[PDB]
DNA sequence: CCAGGGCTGATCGTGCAAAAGTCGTGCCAGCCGTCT
């Protein structure tokens with residue numbers, strides 16, 4: 001509900017439309033898909049969805065679907081009421097349940113193994129997750145929001161990703177425009193990144209931007225995303241020096257031998 | 259003078275499992291009873 005303090009810096013007149021779209025999704029409990037490319041700041045949008053929802057007071061755990069162990073999947077997702085030691089007074093909590101009352105964020109959906117895919121598909125459709133041991137089903141209420149950069153229709157075509165959980169979890173998608181599509185906010189991000197760098201390196205003052213530098217970073221196909229642009233500025237501002245002259249040289253990729 | 263943070267000690271806990279041991283039941287050898 002309360003707008004958390006985050007950097008979205010939106011002026012592209014397309015990012016504003018995406019922001020309105022996600023704001024419309026803020027109250028609803030329906031599953032949400034975030035579609036983007038490398039970088040693109042999808043995590044900020046996901047945090048925006050969770051943190052402007054009715055259940056925002058709830059927790060906001062975010063699991064890395066690539067990071068879950070294969071064998072330990074069941075206990076990791078559910079937990080075991082039995083303690084680690086004899087006569088234990090408590091148990092470890094699984095990924096699920098630890099999310100109840102709030103949203104669960106999923107990332108790298110495409111690279112999730114088939115074991116994760118099939119185990120996660122069963123739990124969402126019905127809930128009633130049961131920890132290993134005992135016969136007591138616990139009912140859960142968790143919002144799911146996920147972000148990915150690969151092409152899950154192609155993943156379905158190859159069959160390396162099950163289409164059923166996709167269909168269940170594809171109520172609505174939000175499209176994120178690439179930085180090259182935005183092509184208007186580059187000045188403001190460049191400047192904000194440079195100002196942050198000024199304090200990080202403890203440089204005294206920002207020198208300024210030359211027209212040649214503006215032309216070169218503007219006239220770029222930008223396969224890299226906002227973070228690639230961020231790193232670019234980071235490299236050039238440091239290589240420039242102590243701001244006695246305006247910033248003049250931009251190195252697009254630090255790989256050319258020279 | 260009252261409230262927040264740190265820190266130290268007080269408190270909780272009689273089961274798991276691996277290996278030795280024991281169980282029942284069979285196989286075979288050696289001595290004894292008896293008829294031919």
Ligand SMILES: Nc1ncnc2c1ncn2[C@@H]1O[C@H](COP(=O)(O)OP(=O)(O)O)[C@@H](O)[C@H]1O
Nearest residue numbers: 007008009037038039040041042043044226227
């Ligand atoms: N609007 C924005 N404001 C501030 N930073 C941004 C913005 N968009 C992108 N970024 C930067 O780009 C990065 C994208 O990270 P992330 O969303 O994790 O990429 P991916 O979704 O591919 O994993 C973030 O670390 C963030 O610092």
